[PDB]
Coordinates of C-alpha atoms and ligand atoms in Angstrom, one line a residue:
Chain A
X1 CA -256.9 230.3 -24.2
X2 CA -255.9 232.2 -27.4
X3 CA -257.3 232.2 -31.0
X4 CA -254.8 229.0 -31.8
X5 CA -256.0 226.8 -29.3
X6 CA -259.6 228.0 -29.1
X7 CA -259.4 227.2 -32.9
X8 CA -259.0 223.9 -32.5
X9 CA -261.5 223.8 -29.0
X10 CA -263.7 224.7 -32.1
X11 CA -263.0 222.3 -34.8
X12 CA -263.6 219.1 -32.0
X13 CA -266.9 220.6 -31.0
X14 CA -268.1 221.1 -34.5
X15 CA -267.1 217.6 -35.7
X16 CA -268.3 215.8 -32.8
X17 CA -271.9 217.7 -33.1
X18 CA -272.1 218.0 -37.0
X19 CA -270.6 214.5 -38.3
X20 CA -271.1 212.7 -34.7
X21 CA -267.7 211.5 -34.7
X22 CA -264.1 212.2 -33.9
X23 CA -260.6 211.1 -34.4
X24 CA -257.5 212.6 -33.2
X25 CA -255.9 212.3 -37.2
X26 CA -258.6 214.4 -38.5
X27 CA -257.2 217.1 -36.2
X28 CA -254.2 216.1 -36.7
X29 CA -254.3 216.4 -40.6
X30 CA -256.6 220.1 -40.4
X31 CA -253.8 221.4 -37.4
X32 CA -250.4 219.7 -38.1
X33 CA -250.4 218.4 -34.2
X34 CA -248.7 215.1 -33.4
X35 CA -251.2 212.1 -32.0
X36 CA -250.4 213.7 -28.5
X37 CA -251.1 217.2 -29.2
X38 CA -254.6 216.0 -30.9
X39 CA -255.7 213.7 -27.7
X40 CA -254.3 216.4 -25.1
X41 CA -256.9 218.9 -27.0
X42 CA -259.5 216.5 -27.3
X43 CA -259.0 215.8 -22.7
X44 CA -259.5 219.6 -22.6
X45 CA -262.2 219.9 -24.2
X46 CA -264.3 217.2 -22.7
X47 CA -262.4 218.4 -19.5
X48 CA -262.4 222.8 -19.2
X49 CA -264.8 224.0 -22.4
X50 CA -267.8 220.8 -22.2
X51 CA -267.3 218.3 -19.1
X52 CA -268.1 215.3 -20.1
X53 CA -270.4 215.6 -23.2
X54 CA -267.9 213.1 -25.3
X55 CA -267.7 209.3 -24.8
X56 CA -264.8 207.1 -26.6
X57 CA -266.5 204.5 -28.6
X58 CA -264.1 201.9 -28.9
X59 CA -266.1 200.2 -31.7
X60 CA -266.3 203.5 -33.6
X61 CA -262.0 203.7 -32.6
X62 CA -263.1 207.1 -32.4
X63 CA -265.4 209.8 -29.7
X64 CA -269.0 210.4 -30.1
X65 CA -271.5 213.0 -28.3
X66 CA -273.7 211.7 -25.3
X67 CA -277.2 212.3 -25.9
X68 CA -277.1 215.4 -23.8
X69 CA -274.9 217.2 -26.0
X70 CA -275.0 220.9 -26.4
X71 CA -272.5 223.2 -27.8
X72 CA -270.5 225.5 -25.7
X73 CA -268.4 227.6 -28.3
X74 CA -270.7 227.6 -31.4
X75 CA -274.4 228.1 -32.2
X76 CA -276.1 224.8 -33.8
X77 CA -276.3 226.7 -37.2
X78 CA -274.7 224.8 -39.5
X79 CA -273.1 228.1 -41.2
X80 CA -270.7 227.1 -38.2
X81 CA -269.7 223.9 -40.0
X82 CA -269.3 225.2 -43.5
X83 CA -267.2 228.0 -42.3
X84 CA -264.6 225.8 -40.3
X85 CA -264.3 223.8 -43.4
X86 CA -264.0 226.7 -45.9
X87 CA -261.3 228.3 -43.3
X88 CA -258.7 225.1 -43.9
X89 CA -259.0 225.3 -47.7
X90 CA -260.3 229.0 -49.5
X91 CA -261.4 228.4 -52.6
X92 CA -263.0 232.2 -52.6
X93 CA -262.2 232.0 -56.8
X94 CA -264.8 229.1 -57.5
X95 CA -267.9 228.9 -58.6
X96 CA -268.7 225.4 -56.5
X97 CA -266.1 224.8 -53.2
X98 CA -265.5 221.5 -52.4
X99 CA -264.2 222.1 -48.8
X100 CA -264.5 218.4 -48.4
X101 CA -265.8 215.3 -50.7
X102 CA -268.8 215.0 -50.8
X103 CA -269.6 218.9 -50.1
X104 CA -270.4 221.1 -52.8
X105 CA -271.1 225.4 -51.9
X106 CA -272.4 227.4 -54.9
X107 CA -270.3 231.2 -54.1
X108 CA -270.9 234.3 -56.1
X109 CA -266.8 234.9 -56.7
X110 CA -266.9 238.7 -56.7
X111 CA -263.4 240.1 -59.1
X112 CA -265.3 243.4 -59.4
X113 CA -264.4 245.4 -55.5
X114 CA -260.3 246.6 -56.1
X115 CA -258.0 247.0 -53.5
X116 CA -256.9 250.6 -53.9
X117 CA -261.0 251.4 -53.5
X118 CA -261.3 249.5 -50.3
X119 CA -258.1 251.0 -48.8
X120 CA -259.3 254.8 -49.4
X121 CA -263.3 254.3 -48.4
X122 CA -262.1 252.1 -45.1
X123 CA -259.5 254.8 -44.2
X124 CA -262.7 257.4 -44.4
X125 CA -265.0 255.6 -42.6
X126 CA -262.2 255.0 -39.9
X127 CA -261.3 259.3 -39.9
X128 CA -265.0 260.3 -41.1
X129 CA -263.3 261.6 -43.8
X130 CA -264.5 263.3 -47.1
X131 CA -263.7 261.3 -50.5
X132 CA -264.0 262.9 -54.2
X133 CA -264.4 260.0 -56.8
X134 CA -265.8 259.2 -60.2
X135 CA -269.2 257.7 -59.9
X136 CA -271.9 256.4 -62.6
X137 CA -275.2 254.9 -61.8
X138 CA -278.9 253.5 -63.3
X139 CA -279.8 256.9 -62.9
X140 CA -277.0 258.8 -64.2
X141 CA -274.8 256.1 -65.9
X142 CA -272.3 258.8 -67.6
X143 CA -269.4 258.8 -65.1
X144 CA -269.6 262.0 -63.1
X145 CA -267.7 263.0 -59.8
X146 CA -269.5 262.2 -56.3
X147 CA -268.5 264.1 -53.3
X148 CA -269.7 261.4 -50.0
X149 CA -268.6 261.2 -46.6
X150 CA -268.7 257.4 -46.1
X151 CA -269.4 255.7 -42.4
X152 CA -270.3 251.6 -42.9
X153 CA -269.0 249.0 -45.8
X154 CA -271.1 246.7 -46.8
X155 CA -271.4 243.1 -48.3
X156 CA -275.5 242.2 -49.1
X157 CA -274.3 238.4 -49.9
X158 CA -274.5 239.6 -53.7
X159 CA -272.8 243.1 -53.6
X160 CA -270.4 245.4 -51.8
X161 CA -271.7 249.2 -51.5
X162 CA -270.6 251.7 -49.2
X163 CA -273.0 253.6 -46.5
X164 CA -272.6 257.2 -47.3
X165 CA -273.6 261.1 -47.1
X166 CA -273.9 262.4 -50.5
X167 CA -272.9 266.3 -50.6
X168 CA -274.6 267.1 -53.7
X169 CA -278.2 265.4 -52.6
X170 CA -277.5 265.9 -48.9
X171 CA -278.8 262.2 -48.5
X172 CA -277.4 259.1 -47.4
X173 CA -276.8 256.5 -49.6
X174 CA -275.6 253.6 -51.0
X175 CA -272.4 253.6 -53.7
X176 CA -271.7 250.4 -55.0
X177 CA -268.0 249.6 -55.3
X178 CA -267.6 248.2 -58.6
X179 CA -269.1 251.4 -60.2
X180 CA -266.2 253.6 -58.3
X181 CA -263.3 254.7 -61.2
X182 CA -260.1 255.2 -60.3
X183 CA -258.7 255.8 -56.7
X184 CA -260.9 258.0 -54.4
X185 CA -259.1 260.7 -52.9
X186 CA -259.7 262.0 -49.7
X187 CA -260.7 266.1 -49.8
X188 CA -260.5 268.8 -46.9
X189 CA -263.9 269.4 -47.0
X190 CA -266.4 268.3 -43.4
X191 CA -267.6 265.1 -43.0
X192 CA -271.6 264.9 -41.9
X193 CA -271.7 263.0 -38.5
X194 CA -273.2 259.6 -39.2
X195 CA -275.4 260.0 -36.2
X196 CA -277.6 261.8 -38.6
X197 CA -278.4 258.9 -41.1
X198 CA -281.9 258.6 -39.7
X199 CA -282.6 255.2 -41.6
X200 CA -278.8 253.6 -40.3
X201 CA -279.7 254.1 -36.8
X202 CA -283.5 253.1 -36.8
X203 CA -284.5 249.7 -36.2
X204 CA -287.6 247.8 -37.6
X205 CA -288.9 244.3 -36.9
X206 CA -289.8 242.7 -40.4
X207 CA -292.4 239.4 -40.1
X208 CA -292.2 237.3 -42.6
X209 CA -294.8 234.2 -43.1
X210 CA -295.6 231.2 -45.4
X211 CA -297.4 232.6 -48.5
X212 CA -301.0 233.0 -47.7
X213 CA -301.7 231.3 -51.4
X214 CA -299.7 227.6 -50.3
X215 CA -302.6 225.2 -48.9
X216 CA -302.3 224.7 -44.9
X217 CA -300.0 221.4 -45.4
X218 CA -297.8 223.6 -47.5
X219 CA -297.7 226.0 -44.8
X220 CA -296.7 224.1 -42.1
X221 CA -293.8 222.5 -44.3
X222 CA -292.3 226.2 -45.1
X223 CA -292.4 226.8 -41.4
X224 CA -289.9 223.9 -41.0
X225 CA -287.7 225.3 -44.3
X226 CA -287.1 228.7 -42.0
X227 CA -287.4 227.1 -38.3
X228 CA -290.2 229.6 -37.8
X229 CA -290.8 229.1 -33.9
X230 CA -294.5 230.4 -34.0
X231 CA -295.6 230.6 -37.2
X232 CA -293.3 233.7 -38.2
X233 CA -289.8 234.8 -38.8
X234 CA -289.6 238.3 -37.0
X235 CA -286.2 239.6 -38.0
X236 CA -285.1 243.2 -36.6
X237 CA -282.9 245.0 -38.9
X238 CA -281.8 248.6 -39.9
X239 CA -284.1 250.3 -41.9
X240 CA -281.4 251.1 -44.5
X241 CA -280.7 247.6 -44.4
X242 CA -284.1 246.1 -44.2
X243 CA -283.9 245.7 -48.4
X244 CA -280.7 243.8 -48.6
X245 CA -282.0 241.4 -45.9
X246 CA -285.3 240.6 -48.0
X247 CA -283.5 239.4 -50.8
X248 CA -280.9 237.5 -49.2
X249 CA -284.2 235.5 -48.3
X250 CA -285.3 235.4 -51.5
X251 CA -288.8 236.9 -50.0
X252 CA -291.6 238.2 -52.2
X253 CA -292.0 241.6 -52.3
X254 CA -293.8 243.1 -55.3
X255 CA -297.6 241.6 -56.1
X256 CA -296.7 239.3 -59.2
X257 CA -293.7 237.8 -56.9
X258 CA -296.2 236.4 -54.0
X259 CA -298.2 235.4 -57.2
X260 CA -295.7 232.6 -58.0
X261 CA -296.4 230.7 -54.3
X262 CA -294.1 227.6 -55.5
X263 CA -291.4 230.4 -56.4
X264 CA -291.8 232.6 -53.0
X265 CA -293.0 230.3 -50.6
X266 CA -291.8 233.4 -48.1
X267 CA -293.4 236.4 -47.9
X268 CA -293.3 240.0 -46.2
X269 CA -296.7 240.6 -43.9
X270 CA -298.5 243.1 -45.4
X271 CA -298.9 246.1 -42.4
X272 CA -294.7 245.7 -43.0
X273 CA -295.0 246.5 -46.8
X274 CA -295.8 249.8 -45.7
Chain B
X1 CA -242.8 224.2 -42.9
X2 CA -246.3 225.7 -41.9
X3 CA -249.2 224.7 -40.3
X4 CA -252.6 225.9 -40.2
X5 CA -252.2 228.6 -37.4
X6 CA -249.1 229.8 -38.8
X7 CA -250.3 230.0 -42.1
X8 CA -253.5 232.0 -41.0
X9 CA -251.2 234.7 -39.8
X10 CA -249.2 234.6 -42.8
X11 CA -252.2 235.4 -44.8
X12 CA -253.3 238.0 -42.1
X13 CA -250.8 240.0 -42.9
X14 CA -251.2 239.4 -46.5
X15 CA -254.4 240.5 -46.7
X16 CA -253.9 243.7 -43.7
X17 CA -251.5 245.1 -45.9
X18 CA -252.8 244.3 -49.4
X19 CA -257.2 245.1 -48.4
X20 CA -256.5 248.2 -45.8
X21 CA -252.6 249.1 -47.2
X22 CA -251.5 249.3 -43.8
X23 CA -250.2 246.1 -40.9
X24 CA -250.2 247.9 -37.5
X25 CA -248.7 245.5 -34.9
X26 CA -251.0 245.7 -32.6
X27 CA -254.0 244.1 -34.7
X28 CA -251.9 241.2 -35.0
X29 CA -250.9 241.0 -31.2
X30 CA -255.2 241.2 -30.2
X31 CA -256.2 238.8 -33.2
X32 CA -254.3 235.9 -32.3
X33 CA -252.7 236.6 -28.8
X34 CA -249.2 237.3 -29.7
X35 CA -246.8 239.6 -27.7
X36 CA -245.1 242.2 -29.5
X37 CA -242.3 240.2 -29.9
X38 CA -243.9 237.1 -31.7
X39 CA -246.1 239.7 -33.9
X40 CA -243.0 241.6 -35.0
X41 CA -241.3 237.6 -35.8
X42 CA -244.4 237.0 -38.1
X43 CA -243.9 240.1 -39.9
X44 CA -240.0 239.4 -40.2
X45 CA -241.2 235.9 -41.4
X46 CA -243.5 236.8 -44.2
X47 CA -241.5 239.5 -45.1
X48 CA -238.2 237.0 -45.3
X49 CA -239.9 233.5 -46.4
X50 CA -243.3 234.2 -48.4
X51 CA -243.1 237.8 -50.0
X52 CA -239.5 239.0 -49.8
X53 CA -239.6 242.9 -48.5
X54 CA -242.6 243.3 -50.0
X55 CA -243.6 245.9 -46.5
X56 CA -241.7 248.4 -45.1
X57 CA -241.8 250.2 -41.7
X58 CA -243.2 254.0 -41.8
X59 CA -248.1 254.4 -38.5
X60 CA -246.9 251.9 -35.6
X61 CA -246.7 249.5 -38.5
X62 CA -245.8 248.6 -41.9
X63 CA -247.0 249.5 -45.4
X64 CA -247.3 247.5 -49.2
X65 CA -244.1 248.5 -51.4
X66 CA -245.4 249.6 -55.1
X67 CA -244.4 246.8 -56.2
X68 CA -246.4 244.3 -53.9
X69 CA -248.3 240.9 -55.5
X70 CA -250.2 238.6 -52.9
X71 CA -248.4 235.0 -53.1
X72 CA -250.9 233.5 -50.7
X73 CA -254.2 234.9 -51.5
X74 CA -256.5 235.9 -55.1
X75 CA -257.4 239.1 -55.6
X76 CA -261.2 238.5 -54.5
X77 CA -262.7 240.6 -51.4
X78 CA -264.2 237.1 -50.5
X79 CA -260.7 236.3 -48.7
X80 CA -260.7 240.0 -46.2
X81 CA -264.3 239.1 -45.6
X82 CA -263.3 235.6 -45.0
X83 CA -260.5 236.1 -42.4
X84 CA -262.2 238.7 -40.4
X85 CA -265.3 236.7 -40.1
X86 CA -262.9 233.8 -38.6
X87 CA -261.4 236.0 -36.3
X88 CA -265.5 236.7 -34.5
X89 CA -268.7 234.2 -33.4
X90 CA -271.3 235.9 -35.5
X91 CA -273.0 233.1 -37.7
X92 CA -275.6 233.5 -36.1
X93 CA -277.2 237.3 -36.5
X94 CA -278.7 238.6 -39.3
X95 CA -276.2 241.7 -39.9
X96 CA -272.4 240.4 -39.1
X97 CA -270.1 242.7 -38.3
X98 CA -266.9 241.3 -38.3
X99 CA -265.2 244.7 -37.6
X100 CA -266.6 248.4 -36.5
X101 CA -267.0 250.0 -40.0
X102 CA -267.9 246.6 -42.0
X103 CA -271.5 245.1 -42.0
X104 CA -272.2 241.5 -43.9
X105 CA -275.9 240.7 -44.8
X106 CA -276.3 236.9 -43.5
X107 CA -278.8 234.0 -43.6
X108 CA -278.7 232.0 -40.4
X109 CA -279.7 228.6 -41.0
X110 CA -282.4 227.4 -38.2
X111 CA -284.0 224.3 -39.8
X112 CA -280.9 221.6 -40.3
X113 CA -280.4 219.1 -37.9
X114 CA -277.0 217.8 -36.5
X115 CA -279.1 214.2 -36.1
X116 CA -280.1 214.4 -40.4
X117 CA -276.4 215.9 -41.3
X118 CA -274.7 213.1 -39.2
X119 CA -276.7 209.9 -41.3
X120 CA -276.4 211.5 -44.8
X121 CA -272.5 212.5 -44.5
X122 CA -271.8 209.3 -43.3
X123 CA -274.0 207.7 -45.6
X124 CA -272.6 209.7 -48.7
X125 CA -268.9 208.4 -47.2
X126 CA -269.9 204.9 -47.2
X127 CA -272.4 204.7 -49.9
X128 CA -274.7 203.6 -47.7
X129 CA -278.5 203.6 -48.4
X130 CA -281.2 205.3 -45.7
X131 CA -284.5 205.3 -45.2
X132 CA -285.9 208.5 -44.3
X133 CA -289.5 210.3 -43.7
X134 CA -289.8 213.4 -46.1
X135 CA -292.7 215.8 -47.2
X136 CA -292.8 217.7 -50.6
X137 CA -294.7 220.8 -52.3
X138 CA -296.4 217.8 -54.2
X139 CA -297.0 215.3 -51.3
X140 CA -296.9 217.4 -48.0
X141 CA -297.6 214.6 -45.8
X142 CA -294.6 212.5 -43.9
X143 CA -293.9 209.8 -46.2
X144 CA -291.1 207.1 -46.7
X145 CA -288.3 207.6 -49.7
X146 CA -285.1 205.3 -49.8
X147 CA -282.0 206.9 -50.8
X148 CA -278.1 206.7 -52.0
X149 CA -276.5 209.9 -51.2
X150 CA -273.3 211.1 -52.3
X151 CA -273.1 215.3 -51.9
X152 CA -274.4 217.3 -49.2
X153 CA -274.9 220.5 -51.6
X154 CA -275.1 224.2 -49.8
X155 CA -277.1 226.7 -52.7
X156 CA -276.2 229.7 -50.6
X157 CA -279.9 229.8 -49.5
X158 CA -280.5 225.9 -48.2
X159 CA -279.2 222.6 -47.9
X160 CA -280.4 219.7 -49.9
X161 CA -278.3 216.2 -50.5
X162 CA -278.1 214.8 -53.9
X163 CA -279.4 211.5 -53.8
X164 CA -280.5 208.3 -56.3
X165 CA -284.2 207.4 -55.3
X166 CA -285.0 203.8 -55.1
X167 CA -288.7 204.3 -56.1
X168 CA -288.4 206.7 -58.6
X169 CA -285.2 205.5 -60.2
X170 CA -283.4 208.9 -60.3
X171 CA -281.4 211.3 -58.5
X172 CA -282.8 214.3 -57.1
X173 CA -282.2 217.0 -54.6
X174 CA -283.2 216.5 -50.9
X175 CA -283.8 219.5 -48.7
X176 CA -282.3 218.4 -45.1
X177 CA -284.8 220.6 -43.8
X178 CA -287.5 218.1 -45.0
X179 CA -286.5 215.4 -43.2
X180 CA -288.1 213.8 -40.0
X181 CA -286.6 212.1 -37.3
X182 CA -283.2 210.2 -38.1
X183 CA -282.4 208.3 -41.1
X184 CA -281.8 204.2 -40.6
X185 CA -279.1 202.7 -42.6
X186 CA -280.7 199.6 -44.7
X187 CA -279.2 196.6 -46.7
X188 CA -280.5 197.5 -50.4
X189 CA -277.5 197.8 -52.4
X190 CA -276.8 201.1 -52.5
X191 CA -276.7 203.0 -56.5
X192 CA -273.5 203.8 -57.9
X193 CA -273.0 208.3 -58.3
X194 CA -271.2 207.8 -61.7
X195 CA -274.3 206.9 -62.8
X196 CA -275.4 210.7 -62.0
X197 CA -275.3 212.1 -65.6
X198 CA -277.4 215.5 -64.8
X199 CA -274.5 215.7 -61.6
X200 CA -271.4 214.7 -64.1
X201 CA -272.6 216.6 -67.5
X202 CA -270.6 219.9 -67.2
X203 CA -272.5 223.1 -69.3
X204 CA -271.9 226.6 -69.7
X205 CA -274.1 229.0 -69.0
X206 CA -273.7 232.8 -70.8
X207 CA -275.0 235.6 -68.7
X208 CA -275.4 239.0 -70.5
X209 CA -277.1 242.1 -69.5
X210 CA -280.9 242.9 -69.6
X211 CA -281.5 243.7 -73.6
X212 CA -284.2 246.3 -72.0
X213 CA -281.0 248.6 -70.8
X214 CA -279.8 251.4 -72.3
X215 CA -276.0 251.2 -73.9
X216 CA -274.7 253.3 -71.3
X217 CA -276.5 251.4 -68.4
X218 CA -275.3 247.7 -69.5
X219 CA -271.8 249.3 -69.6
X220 CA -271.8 249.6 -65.8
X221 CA -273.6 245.9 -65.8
X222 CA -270.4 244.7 -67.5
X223 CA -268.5 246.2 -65.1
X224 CA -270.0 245.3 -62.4
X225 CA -269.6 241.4 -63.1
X226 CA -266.2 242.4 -64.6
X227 CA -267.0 241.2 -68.3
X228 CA -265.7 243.1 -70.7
X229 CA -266.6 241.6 -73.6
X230 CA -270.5 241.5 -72.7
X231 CA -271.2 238.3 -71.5
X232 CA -270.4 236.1 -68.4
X233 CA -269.5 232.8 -69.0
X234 CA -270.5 230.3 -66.2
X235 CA -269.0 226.2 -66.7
X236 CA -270.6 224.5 -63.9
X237 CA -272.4 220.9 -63.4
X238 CA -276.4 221.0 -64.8
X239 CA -277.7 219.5 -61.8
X240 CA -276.2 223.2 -60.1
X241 CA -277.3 225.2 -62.8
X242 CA -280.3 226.6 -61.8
X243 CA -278.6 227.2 -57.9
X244 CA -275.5 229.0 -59.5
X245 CA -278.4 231.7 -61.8
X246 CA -280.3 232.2 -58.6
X247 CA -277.1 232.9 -56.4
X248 CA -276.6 235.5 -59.4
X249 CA -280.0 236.9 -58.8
X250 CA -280.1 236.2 -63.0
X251 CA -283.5 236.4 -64.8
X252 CA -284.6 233.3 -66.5
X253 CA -287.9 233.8 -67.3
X254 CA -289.3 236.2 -69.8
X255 CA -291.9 238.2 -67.1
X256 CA -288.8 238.3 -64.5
X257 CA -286.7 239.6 -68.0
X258 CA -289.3 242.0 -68.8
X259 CA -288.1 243.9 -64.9
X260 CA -284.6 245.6 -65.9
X261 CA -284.1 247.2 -62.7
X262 CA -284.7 244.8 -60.9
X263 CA -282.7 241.7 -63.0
X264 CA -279.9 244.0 -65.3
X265 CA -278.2 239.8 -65.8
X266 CA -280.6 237.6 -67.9
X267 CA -279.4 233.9 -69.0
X268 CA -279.2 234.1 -72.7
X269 CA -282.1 233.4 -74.4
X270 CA -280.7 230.1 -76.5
X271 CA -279.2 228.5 -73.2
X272 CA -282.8 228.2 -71.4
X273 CA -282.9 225.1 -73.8
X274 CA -279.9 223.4 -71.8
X275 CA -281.6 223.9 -68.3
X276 CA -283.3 220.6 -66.5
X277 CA -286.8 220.9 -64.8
X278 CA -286.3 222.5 -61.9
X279 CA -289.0 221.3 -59.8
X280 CA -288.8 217.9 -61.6
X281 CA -284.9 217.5 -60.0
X282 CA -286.5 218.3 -56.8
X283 CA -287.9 214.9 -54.9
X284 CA -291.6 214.3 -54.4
Ligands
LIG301 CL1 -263.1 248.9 -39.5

């Protein structure tokens, strides 16, 4: 089965787990299928992809999991629910999404990455190429030209940067792509393998626990908020990486930060730190 | 005329040709199946009924004329990242990557329950009211709160419903993750949401960069949030407020101000007066 159809294998096992309930004219509506189309799907799935996990509930005029229901096709995150929603309406511009009634998604609309940027910097990363472009910084914020050899784009969930050699510093680093003027252009000058970016490659295992400072009861309760299976989160991620994941967790870091326990319930072990 | 699947491979192309400047054939034909023959007819379609010769051929593909506009998507980076990360299974690792030189920073969600979500949407559908077991900062032990939900709300960190508690007489934000066992529908009448005035008072916010910056360095703070004029203005509901600043990574306190590295966007100091409580609008 293909992307179309698996699509739709996907859309009856997400609203049968996540709402516990499904008609054919919800599928009918997201997919444009006729009434036969929608049941047909339905008989396949419950047939080839999940035997037998969905019962018709007359009553309900509609199918419902058994007990024993596990999915096949999707983790049971619930990202997997928002992002079959957000697929059949994008509303990437707003603030709030309404994908539905009576869901709301707070987004971070980003107008700042341009097209022209993206093209040139995906086109080196795809021919290790070389790109010249006009760069300004925290550091350095007077717009100067940056010589880099990029490898990796990234999105952090609140920025896009690019993973790249730096010929001046001889470093990798990250060059945010909202602070790129202009067009890069790409320069016959060698590339640096990306092989060679040390903290890219290397892999460590960050633990992250309930802040020591919460009472026991308050503990147990932030294990729940993160699922923590026994008493940790241990998350393995790329060095060069390791940053971007802390703060996407909203994890304390600095000494003041674990301070405020209400604020940063979540906090990095300290052997980690260093 | 389009469906769904048809219209997902209209703005495939769309965004191929607009994000990476270049549709090659074969990316089609492995994203969605196709033979040659079907992904050259989409092209001939979107080229014919959606963006009239806006690509030409050249690269075992096509290419953006000068002149090309989307017509299906905005100009945001949120749509490529959205259609490639349809295209893979990956909401569930840390790092994503939705294609070989493209890595998304994600937060898997491990603590909601299919068994909560399926009571409170249906609830929030039928304005129904539920008891449930919950457990606070304040009052960490299981305890019993009645609710009327209407919104399931996603912060971009966690999931809480907005609810009217019967006890308390107001509406507050429920984390799903605090929630035992299943909700049970009851037969209290169930509160009216237009009565919701933190959720229906509309307010803008005005972000601005971090006075502690240099000229030259809240320059690049402008341009990075793409306001030119120095400040960022944010309309949104007040009972979101304080989810929208965090989701911004925006300072709102003085000591957090005092950090400009660290928070180069700070709320302006004469809207902190418009924020609610936020660990009052959180339930006990
Ligand atoms: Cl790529």
């Amino acid at each position: 089965d293909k992307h179309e159809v698996l699509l739709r294998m996907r859309a009856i096992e997400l609203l049968a787990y996540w709402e516990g309930r499904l008609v054919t004219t919800r599928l009918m509506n997201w997919f444009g299928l006729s009434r036969q189309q929608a049941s047909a799907d339905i008989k396949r799935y419950n047939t080839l992809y999940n035997p037998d996990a969905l019962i018709h509930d007359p009553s309900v005029k509609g199918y419902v999991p058994k007990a024993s229901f596990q999915p096949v096709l999707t983790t049971a995150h619930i990202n997997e629910y928002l992002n079959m929603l957000s697929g059949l309406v994008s509303e990437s511009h707003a603030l709030i999404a309404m994908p539905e009634p009576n869901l709301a998604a707070v987004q971070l609309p980003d107008r700042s990455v341009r097209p022209e940027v993206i093209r040139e910097v995906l086109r080196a990363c795809r021919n290790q190429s070389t790109l010249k472009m006009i760069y300004a910084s925290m550091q350095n914020p007077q717009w100067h030209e940056r010589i880099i050899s990029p490898h990796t784009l990234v999105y952090t969930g609140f920025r896009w940067h690019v993973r790249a050699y730096c010929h001046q510093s001889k470093q990798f680093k990250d060059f945010l792509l909202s602070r790129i003027d202009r067009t890069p252009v790409v320069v016959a000058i060698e590339s640096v393998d990306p092989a060679q970016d040390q903290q890219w490659h290397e892999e460590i295992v960050l633990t992250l626990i309930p802040n020591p400072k919460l009472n026991s009861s308050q503990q147990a309760l932030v294990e729940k908020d993160f699922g923590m299976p026994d008493g940790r989160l241990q998350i393995p991620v790329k060095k060069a990486l390791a940053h971007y994941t802390l703060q996407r967790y909203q994890t304390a870091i600095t000494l003041a930060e674990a301070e405020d326990a209400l604020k940063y319930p979540l906090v990095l072990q300290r052997s980690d730190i260093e």
